[PDB]
Structure formats: C-alpha cells, structure tokens
Design a protein around this ligand. Structure first.
Ligand SMILES: O=C1[C@@H]2C[C@@H]3C[C@H]1C[C@@](C(=O)N1CCN(c4ccc([N+](=O)[O-])c5ncccc45)CC1)(C3)C2
Ligand SMILES: O=C1[C@@H]2C[C@@H]3C[C@H]1C[C@@](C(=O)N1CCN(c4ccc([N+](=O)[O-])c5ncccc45)CC1)(C3)C2
Lengths: 763, 763
C-alpha cells in the first residue's frame, strides 16, 4: 500500500492545481522544526511552541515557501496562558529570510521582538508583527519593505503588553512604501498619526490608541483609503472592565471639520468609544460612498436627537449608535431625529445602550419608509411599556430585536494565539413577560419566529395563547416554567415546524401532576422538537405521536425513571413517531437500556445519540431492529465490551462513535464483513492492542475517518502488524504522532506509534 | 474520675429540679433498643431506625416514662429517603403500653400502622399517629382514649401516602373524648367533618382535605375552639407544583353564612387555598376575638376591592391575602377598599400575589392611619412604577417589603422525620434598579436599612448616591456590580454601621482597574463589613483603615494573588484596622501564608477564620504576634502537622478548630501547659493514636467540648490508656459511640471506642 513512512508530525495538504503544499504544525509543542521538510512546501505554519530561535539553516533548502506562520511561540506576560514560559525573547540571526526568494507572507505575532527583523526578501507582501515589544519605527529598518502591502504593527504597547513609552515614529517612516495598502497600529500607545502615510493606503487601523488631536494635514494625501478606524482614542472610561486612560477634562477626540476631505473612496469609518458629543456634518462632506459608520460608546444622546450629519450619508449601509446614554439620566422615550429618513440604503440599525422608559408607536416613525431596513436592534434599553402591535408596520424587516429590556404584557479584532433563516423574527427573549395573552401578539401574523427565552413564564397552555401567530414556523420557549397539563398545547400553531421548550424543568421536576407528552399529535408540520434539559421524570400519556416530527432532542432529562425495571409502560414512548430520524436521548442518567425498548423505537430512525448517559452494559444484538440507523453515538459512556460482530449487529450503521469510553481490548472479528461502515471513533479509551484478524484492508480501505488517540496503547512486539499497519496505511488518523502515544514498555514510554521500529523482533 | 462505664449509645440529660431523665437516640440506626436503660427515665426518643417491632418486654422495667417518641422508623414510600427500607410495616403486640402508668405522651408518626394501637394507659395525654395508614376511625378503638388531650391523626391519605379510600369516621367517634383539646385530621382525604366533635376542643386542623361542603350543625357545639384550619379544601389548582384534586365546576368551599355561630373564642381562622370568591360578613358575626385570618390562594381579587367583612374584625392582628390574582389579568393598580381602615389592631398585612402595574401614593390611603401596622408585604407583584418618596408617611412601620417586583428608577406544618433589628427597613431586593439617584431615596431619611440585593447595579459610586439616607445603619448591596474606583464610596453614610457589598465580583474580577479598598476610612461608626464572594484580585490602595471596624468577612476572594511570593505590598492589608476583632478570610485559595503577614494583622483580633482555603503548611510560631486570638478556625483545610507546643504557640487561644483536616498523629507535648484552652475540634481526621503525655487531666478537666469523630482510630493494644481515658472520663465527646469507630485490627473493625475491652493486653 505504502513504502514511504513519513514521520512528520505535521498535517500535510496538497493542492496540485494551486501548487500549494501546506504543512500545519498547530499546537504541536515542538522545540526544533522537524527534519526532512519536502522542498515543494509553500505554506508553513508554526503556532504556539517552544522553539528558542531561528537560524538561516531553518529555511535553507526551502525556496518555494510563500507563507511562514511563526505566531506566538513565547506569548507575552498577559496575552496567553502562563503554562508555557520561554526563558527569554525570540531572536533571529541576520539573513534568516533572504534565502526565500518566493516568500510573500510572514506572521511573527506574539514573540516579544524588540525591533523589526532585517534581511527580509523584497518579494514579501505581508508582514505582521503584532503583540511584540516594537515601540520604535525608523526609516532605515523600513527601507527593505519597499514592496510590502500589509503591515500589522499592532498591540505593541497597551495594558496587556506594556512598554511604558509612547510610540515613536520618525517623520516619513512609511512614506517610501509605495505598495503599502493595509497598516494597523492598534494598541500601540500612539500619540500622533505617523504623517506622512503612503498615498496607496486602503485600510488604516489606528484604533485603541492615545491619539488626542487630529491634524488637518493628516489624511491630506490618502485618496484611496477605504477603511479608517479611530476607535478608542479618548475613550468612554465609565464602568469599563479594562484599564483605560481617558483624556483630560473629559474632552473628545479633537477632529477638525476639514479632516476627511481627501478621503473620497472611504466606505468604513468607525469612531466607536471616542467620548464624542457632537458630529459635525462637515466631516461627511467629501465621503459620498460611506457604507459603515460606528459611533458607539460616546455621548451622542443629544446628537441622535438632532442627527444632522445623517443628511450627508445617502449610501450608508450600517449605523452603530450603541451605548450613547448619559449618566444618571433615565429617559422617558427614545428621541430619534427625522433625518433618519434620509438613510435610503440603510439595512442594519443598532441603537442599543440608549436606555429609556417607554417605546411608543410614533417614536419609530422616521424608520417607517426605509425599504432596505432589515435589522432593528433595540436590546439593552430597559424598556417598560412597548405595545407589540405597533410592529405591524415593520413587516418588510427581518430581525426585530426586543432583548433583555423589561417589556411586560475593547479589541474585538483580537486574533488570539437560529431564526434569521426562517423569515421575520421577534426576539422577545429575557424580557419581563410572565404570562401570554392572545391580544398581545395581535397584528403579528407575519411573524415566522418568536423568541421567548428566559422570560420565566409560568403558564398552563390550553391552546389559546398564540392564536394570531398563524404563520409561526419557530417558537423558542426555553428557560421558562411550562406546565404540560393539556394535550392541546400549541394546537393553534398550525404552521409550526420547530418548537423549543427546553430548560422548563420547574414543573417537570414535580411528581404526580399530569405531563401530556402527546401534545405533538395536533402539530401536522412539526419538523424539530427541542425539549432538552427539562428533567422530565413522569408522563401521564403513554406514547408520543406525530405525522411529521423528524428531529427530537431529549437530552438532560430523566429516562432512567421512565424506563425503570419492570415498568413496561413508557417503553414505546417514541414508537408512534413515524417520521423520526434524529433522536438525541443523551445525558439521561441511563445506567442500562432494558431489553425491548428498541422495539418501541421509530422505524425510520437514522441518528441516535446516547452520550454522557452512563450505560454500564449496552446490548448490541438489539440493533437489528433499527434497520435505518447510521449514526449511533455512544460517546462519553461507561461501556465495557464492544459487539461480537458488527456485520451481525447492523447492516446500515456507518458512524459508530465511542469517544471517552472504557474499552480495554477489541474483539477478533469486530469489523468482519461490515463493509457499509464509513466512520469509527475510539478516542480516549483504555485499549491495549489491536490485531489484524479484526481489521482487514477490505474494510479499512473505505473508512473516511478513524480516531484512535489519547488511549493506552502498549507498544511491545505483541502487535508488530499494527506497526506495519500504522505507518504504512493511508487511513486517516488525526493526531497520529503527538496524542496517541505508547505507555510502555519501560524505555518505550511516550513514543509515537508512527515512529515505531523494533528491530529486535525478528532477528 | 469515673468507675461506671455506661456503654449506652444515646445522649443522657438530667434535670433534677424537673425530674427529667431524657434519653435521646436520634439518628442512631439501632435495630433493637439497647439494654440497661436506667429506670428513672422519663423522656424516651427513637427517631428513624431499623427496629422491627415492639413487645411488652420493651418498657417492662420503665414505669416512670412520660414521653415515648417512636417516630418514622419505617417511613412511607414517598415521605422520606429510600435508603432505609423496612421489610414490612410496624407491629405492636397487645398490652405494650399498659405497663406505663405514668405515660403522658406518645409519638408514632410515619410507621405505617393500619389502625390505632390498643392497650394504651388512661394517663396518656398526647398521641400522634401521623403519616400512617389509618383511614378508619371507630368508637371501640377510641374508648380507651377517654383522657386524651392532643390527637394528631393527620397525613394518613394523600398524594405522598395514598390509601385510595375516603376517610371513614363513624358517628360520634370523638364525642366521648371529654378531655380532647387538639385534633388534626390534615391530609386524610376526609369528605365530611366528623360530627359530633367534643365540646372541649381548642384547636381543629382539618386542612388539606377533600371536604366540599360545611354543614350548619357542624361547629354547633364547639364554643371553646380557638384555631380552625380549613385550608386546601377545594384548592386553587392552577400552576400547583403538587398533585391536587379541585372540586367540580370550580366551586369554592361551600360554607354557610350561619356556620361560625357557636365559635366565640376563635382567634385563628385560616381559609387559605379554598378557591373562595366571596367572603360574606355573616361569617364574622359571632367571632369577635379573631386575631389571625388567612385567605391566600383564592379568587378574592374582586373581594379585596369591596372587603365588607373587614368591618367585623376590630381585633384582627394578621391578615394574609396573598396570591389572589386572576388569570390573564394584569391590573393597572391595586384596589384596596376603604374598610381596611377598620383594622385598628392590624400589625402584619401581606398582599403578595396581587400582581398589578403601578403602585401610586393614594393606593395605600386606607393604611395611612393604622397606628399598629408594622409589616407591609408587597412582594411578588411585578410593580413597574413606584415612587419611593410616597413611603415618607409610613415612618411608624418596621418592614416595607418591596421584593422581586420590577420597580425601576401545601403543608407548611410538615414536621418531617437581618435588618428587622435595626429599625425601619426598605427591602428593594431583586428589583429592576440599575442605577442609584439621589432624588429617588429622598424623603427617606428615617430609613435604618436599605436592601438592594440582586438589583445588578453597575455604578461607580463617588459619594453622592445615598445622600438623603442620613440615618442609614445597614446597607445591603449584595449581588450587584460595584466599581470601587474612588475611596469616597459610601462617604455620605455617616451613621452607617453594617455594609454588605458581597457578590460584586463582576468589576473585581477585572485586572488593572483601580480598586480602592481604603473606602472605609471615611466610615466613622462602621462596625461590620461583608465583602465576601467578590473575587478581589487586585487593589490600588495598599492598606485598609477604620476607626471602628470590628467585623470583616473576606471569604470567597483571592488573597492568594494579593499575598503572592515576593509581593510584600499587601502584607499589611488589615494592619490599620485597629478595632478589628472578627476576621473571616476563608475560601481564599490560600495555599500557604507567607511569613510576615501576621505582623500586619490587627492587634485587637480575636476571631480568625481560615476555612476551606487549602493551607498546605500553616506555621504556628507566628501566632505569638496575635496575643488576643481566641477562635482560630482552620477547618476544611489540608494541614499536615499540628504545632509543637500550644503553650509556646499562643497564650489566649481557646477555640482551636481543625475540622476536616489531614492529621495522622498528634505530638507528645501538644496540650502541655495550655491551660487557657476551652474548645478543640479534630473531626474528620486521619489520626491513628493519641497517648497520655500530650493529654493530661490538668488540661482535659477544663475543656467544654472536644470532637474526635469520623477519623481512623486504630484500636489495638498500643493505646490502652486511651481506652481507660475514653470510657472513664467525663470530657464531652459527641457521637462517642456511633461515629468514632475502630478501623482495625481485623476482627476489631467498626467497633466503638466506648465499648472497648482488650483483656488479652496484660494477662
Ligand atoms: O447587569 C448588567 C450589565 C452587564 C450588561 C447587562 C447588564 C446591563 C449592563 C449595562 O450596560 N447597563 C447597566 C445600567 N446602565 C447604567 C449604568 C450606570 C449609570 N450611571 O452611573 O448613571 C446609568 N445611568 C443612566 C442610565 C443607565 C445607566 C447602562 C446599562 C450591561 C451592565
Ligand atoms: O418565576 C417565578 C415563579 C416562581 C415564583 C417567582 C416567580 C413568579 C412566580 C409567580 O407566582 N407568578 C408568575 C406570574 N403569575 C401569573 C401566572 C400565570 C397567569 N395566567 O395563567 O394568566 C397569570 N395571569 C395574570 C397575572 C399573573 C399570572 C403570577 C406570579 C412565583 C412563578
């Protein structure tokens, strides 16, 4: 099959059409790069490791490298886990990258460098030096980057990685970079923008810095700029969960009126957390193609009432005005200006953090004509009175956020080391609704969704609550207190397809009261039912019936009491679910499955999940009754013995999952004649040996995935074929060189099975 | 010292003045009563056990018994833990109590008896047969109880202990009980009141039954009745967490108008959960001395608006009107009738469960003249708008309950087997207050308390929030998000004595922001400070200062980071607290105390708590610096070695607590010359032997308590003196015969040290 044993502990991906040989050593804890790298490699990745340094002998016989990822080998003091500490910082000998004539990208983030390395090839187009200790920019060290295009010099001096010195950039340091397009100086303690910047810049990220004043001759040459991020300069420090230094006298970022003049191709402008109080319309005079405008965490509560600058943004797509409230000011209503009607191309409008008392109908009148408006975020506003019927005008919308408000009837780009698909959505989750009336949801027949998660509604539904919701296809009733006393629950939701009544264990924990689990009989088009984490311990109805239910999640419940010894009542609980194909009966404290319960299983079942249950002895001969089962899931269980013969067990099972099990040895005809298998998991086990008579190539040649890591393989001369099978077969085994180790014998401890060579076996 | 070794495993209490010898065998798991009971015994108690039966030979030589407690030896199927199952029910041979001429009380609850035992002495005054299977009452079995006074025949037939048959009571079964005063027939599935009842009844508990109609000739002879409990008859079954059977057509308990006529001395009348809709004033025509009236869980929402019957209760003390709301009815205001002004002697008024929208000022106008009104409960009402200034008229009150409402700026007698002491209290806990204004608490200077627990207030207090609270002596700010950025927090609370800022770990978990822990310097009369469970990990201020702080609870925090290795900054964190006497620095993940931190301890410290910390090695010689320490608490720790000599350790330590420790052997001069000791704990340890040279009688004679149970005592001939010391010394050792056992050797496993006799030691 294979006579080329490659002991490389890194993943290899081949793309002949793209000429890409990707070697991936992510999270491999290597101290030195492995020997024998194929010379056709193009992409090279080395994440968090323990590699001390780099020498020119590292990339000596690799010229075709086009991407080198050396990110975060020695993470700084506060940016990563302190379980992997380097003795010192990273050092690079001179001319360590000059031999890479085809290099085009380099990632050196989080390695505690003092200055920019020298000797880089002129073909380099990307260079990222984030999370380093480079707080000084000069021209002589940038002369070699005359052909760079993307430069990430961010996260160099701030509270996570301090340097105690303001960012020093000499005059015209980036001027001679005629090919530079992206420049990110985020979290660098920058005092002034490094003028002059190259005129070919397209993305400028100067956010989360200490820039206090902007000059009129700052962006005077940037005519091709498209993204300008000045967020966090003079930030809003009140109740900030991060160390922030505000400006003196609580002054905002001093931006002149004639500042965004040369910016003509600007499409994204984020001024989030700048302590701004006024937004002059002169800023938006020359930027005609502005699409995204972030103005969050400011003091624009009085500006939103006027909002004159909105008259200069006819092509605005997004508008973030979150958390603009005043201190000790509880407003009675939201004061949206009429100029909001000038945003013709507006799609998303998030006005969170604008806390007020009552949301009336005519308060959203400027938004009554935005034909392109889809999302309307109004969460975290602590609204008290809000008649939902007023939303009968926003039918063309897609998301109506009515979040944690109490209606009643820093660096988000940190690259560290639902209902929107069904239609109209009313997200009333985490509100102060404690009972459901039919008149409250009136004039809301167009709703395809209704999220009532976390409202803590204690109500006995008899089939008269969600009456106006005729077109409802998804109802989220999680984190409440549902009382299933009548089988007529959710009977008026004719077009209901998905029902989530999870986390309603309050009334289900009680013993003796009626629990009609046959409430799905009146649901004719119900496709998915999520009732997990409900602690369902009893049920008056004996069976569950449905003409269309295909998915059922019954995890975190008590089937161990329903299938108790001698209690033959609830054995056929899911037998009448004809169209059921996806069962998720897991975490149900099931210590054993009583013989006969599989006879009360849906005949069309395909997906069975029995994870985190506690099965002490799961029988296998009863799987013949499930002639359509394909994805049996027995992960995180306490099984002891694997089946006798998988061929006699099932004819359609192909996705056996036995993760985190307790198995000490496989059988000797396990995979005999089980050709239909295509997926097997045996991770985190206690097995000792696996022979050949149970693993022939007729069955191994078709398996797509096979996980045999984190176990107790004893690598002695007892399973020599396994050796000849582990390093000479192309079956996909992930983590085959670092996680699956050898616990013995003696000097053979911790050895990888891929590099096994016992010459003293057949001398 | 003592030559009478009593191997009785039950506690003995002697009262010579009362002539009471109380033998207590609570939770002792005995199979047969022990032999050798002293004949002077009067009180005898046997709780949950495994005793099969009783024979006349049990109380043969005990005549002076006046109280026999045989409760709950074989608990029914659902009333107790199923870990102690009896093979059958309890049986009593005839004439098992006739030999007790001085018997006056008998408790036979929860023993699954079928009928009332016969042969009881005529001197019996109390007889309780609760939680049994006695669902039939006859006259021939009650003829022997002609001198009984208290009869508890409750909990005989209901959902916890079913019998499937209505309670059968023959005509005039209790008539000949001329001395009967208390009769409780609760939870017995009674259909009709057992007329006729003895005219000398004073307390009648017929609650939680299935009585549907009351007759006019039912209480016609009860003229000395004082307590009448008819709660749960035709109950309110909506959203009930217990199996309840309501009456047909949703009808209330049919009580005639001329029903409470003969009742003249009635003081307590509870009609809770009767589905009542009207309360006729004719019911309260003859009962002039009614003090307590319970009317909870009814449909009196329209009756509270009228409340005519309140004109007939001039001596009413309590009035419970909780949970009288209507279904699918969210009221806009609380409609209290004017007749509430007729309750001159009213003290407590709980109107919970009366959910409405807004609580205005003039809604409580009838209560504006109740001079005796103290408690005003208004929790669980979901109030939205409620101006607190309107409470400037209820200054004479004591408790103003403003519970889980959202204001913004079955059988409770089941005998199973703060701020009210400081003055005026405003309990605004678990409300929807997210920020504190000075104008909100205006006109509330009389407040001695303010509970703001669970409001989740994210605010940076600078000393201007609680300004009108000049007389505030207690502030509960738990379960919030406090930002201690300024040392001027709570500076305006001049008369503040207790401050609870616990469970505010949100902003304290953040690293880098300022945490001014010296905010107690401006508090001149602060006596107690509770800041536990705050995860305090950093502090800008180095020390904490206070002229008056005496108690400080600092548990559930991170002192393991504040006292890190080499970090000598926060060593003297509590040194400036001069008057500090009670320190509770526990659960702080402290793996070791760095040497020198005790030098930064308050000199006046008396109470130190280091529980659940994780101390791997706690030094003892450093305790000489604490010359006032008396209650050192080292429970639930991982210590290994006890101090060398307690005399050289401390001169005032007297309450050593080493519960749940890991100690394998004591020293040989531990308690030498440590005369001041008066309290020692060594429970849940791993010790093996304790000799005499460390435990002399000069020090053992004064110790009040000494706990040495749940450990690994090896009871071999190695510590014979210990034997002669354990059963011949009167030092108080609780659980000396059941919990402290012997783990060896061999045949001597599980033996009690109190019954140790090794004759083969010195043959
Ligand atoms: O628990 C909670 C957290 C974590 C999240 C959920 C959640 C609410 C949350 C929050 O952002 N908010 C708290 C309440 N907010 C405010 C705070 C202080 C002041 N203030 O100092 O005057 C105010 N004055 C006027 C109006 C609002 C004020 C604004 C809304 C966000 C804190
Ligand atoms: O989570 C929670 C729990 C556990 C406690 C805290 C808490 C509130 C709580 C509660 O007792 N309540 C829920 C809300 N309550 C109600 C429910 C149903 C109906 N209904 O079926 O029409 C109503 N119709 C009108 C008015 C109120 C109604 C009454 C107040 C009590 C349930």
């Amino acid at each position: 099959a294979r006579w080329f044993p490659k002991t490389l502990p890194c993943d290899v991906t081949l793309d002949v059409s793209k000429n890409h040989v990707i070697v991936d050593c992510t999270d491999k804890h290597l101290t030195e790069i492995p020997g024998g790298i194929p010379t056709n490699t193009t992409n090279l990745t080395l994440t968090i490791n323990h590699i001390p340094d780099i020498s020119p002998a590292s990339f000596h016989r690799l010229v075709h490298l086009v991407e080198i990822d050396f990110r975060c080998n020695c993470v700084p003091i506060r940016l990563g886990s302190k379980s992997n500490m380097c003795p010192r910082r990273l050092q690079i000998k001179p001319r360590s990258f000059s031999g890479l004539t085809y290099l085009k990208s380099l990632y050196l983030d989080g390695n505690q460098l003092l200055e920019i390395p020298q000797g880089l090839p002129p073909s380099l187009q990307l260079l990222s030096l984030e999370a380093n200790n480079i707080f000084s920019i000069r021209k002589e060290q940038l002369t070699e980057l005359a052909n760079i295009e993307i430069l990430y010099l961010g996260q160099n001096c701030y509270y996570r990685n301090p340097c105690y010195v303001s960012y020093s950039i000499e005059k015209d340091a980036f001027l001679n970079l005629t090919k530079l397009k992206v420049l990110s100086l985020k979290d660098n303690n920058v005092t002034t923008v490094p003028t002059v910047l190259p005129s070919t810049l397209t993305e400028l990220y100067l956010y989360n810095n200490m820039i206090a004043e902007i000059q009129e001759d700052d962006f005077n040459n940037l005519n091709q700029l498209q993204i300008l991020d000045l967020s966090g300069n003079c930030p809003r420090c009140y109740n900030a969960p991060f160390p922030c230094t505000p400006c003196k006298n609580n002054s905002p970022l001093q931006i002149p009126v004639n500042a965004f003049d040369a910016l003509t191709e600007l499409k994204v402008l984020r001024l989030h957390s700048n302590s701004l109080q006024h937004v002059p319309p002169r800023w938006f005079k020359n930027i005609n193609n502005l699409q995204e405008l972030d103005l969050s965490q400011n003091f624009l509560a009085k500006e939103i009432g006027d909002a004159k600058f909105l008259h200069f943004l006819p092509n605005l797509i997004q508008l973030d005005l979150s958390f603009n409230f005043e201190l000790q000011v509880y407003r009675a209503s939201m004061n949206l200006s009429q100029a909001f009607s000038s945003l013709k191309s507006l799609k998303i409008l998030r006005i969170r953090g604008y806390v007020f008392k009552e949301l009336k109908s005519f308060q959203l009148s400027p938004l009554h004509n935005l034909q392109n408006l889809e999302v309307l975020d109004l969460g975290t506003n602590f609204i008290k009175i809000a008649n939902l019927s007023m939303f009968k005008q926003f039918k063309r919308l897609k998301v109506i956020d009515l979040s944690v408000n109490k209606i009643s009837p820093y660096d988000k780009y940190a690259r560290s080391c639902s209902c929107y698909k069904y239609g109209q959505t009313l997200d009333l989750s985490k509100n102060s609704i404690f009972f459901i009336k039919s008149s409250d949801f009136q004039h809301l027949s167009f709703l395809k969704c209704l999220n009532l998660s976390g409202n803590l509604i204690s109500q006995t539904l008899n089939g008269s609550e969600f009456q106006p919701l005729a077109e409802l296809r998804y109802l989220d009733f999680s984190n409440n207190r549902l009382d299933l006393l009548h089988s007529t629950a959710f009977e008026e939701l004719r077009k209901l397809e998905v029902l989530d009544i999870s986390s309603n264990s309050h009334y289900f924990q009680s013993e003796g009261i009626t629990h009609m689990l046959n409430f799905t009989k009146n649901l004719k088009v119900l496709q998915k039912l999520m009732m997990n984490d409900n602690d369902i311990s009893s049920s008056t109805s004996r069976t569950m019936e449905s003409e269309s239910l295909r998915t059922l999640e019954f995890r975190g419940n008590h089937l161990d009491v329903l299938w108790r010894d001698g209690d033959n009542r609830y054995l056929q609980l899911f037998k009448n679910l004809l169209k059921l194909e996806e069962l998720d009966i897991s975490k149900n404290s099931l210590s054993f499955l009583p013989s006969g319960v599989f006879d009360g299983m849906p005949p069309n079942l395909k997906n069975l999940s029995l994870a985190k249950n506690g099965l002490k002895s799961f029988i296998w001969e009863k799987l013949r009754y499930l002639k359509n089962l394909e994805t049996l899931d027995l992960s995180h269980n306490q099984l002891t013995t694997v089946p006798e013969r998988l061929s006699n067990c099932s004819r359609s099972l192909k996705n056996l999952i036995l993760k985190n099990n307790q198995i000490r040895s496989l059988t000797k005809y396990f995979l005999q004649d089980a050709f239909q298998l295509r997926y097997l998991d045996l991770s985190s086990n206690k097995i000792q040996m696996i022979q050949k008579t149970s693993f022939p190539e007729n069955v191994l040649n078709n398996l797509k995935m096979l996980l045999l890591h984190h176990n107790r393989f004893l690598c002695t001369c007892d399973a020599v074929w396994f050796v000849w099978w582990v390093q000479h077969t192309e079956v996909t085994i992930p983590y085959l060189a670092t996680d699956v180790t050898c616990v013995g014998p003696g000097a053979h401890k911790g050895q990888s099975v891929i590099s096994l060579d016992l010459y003293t076996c057949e001398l």
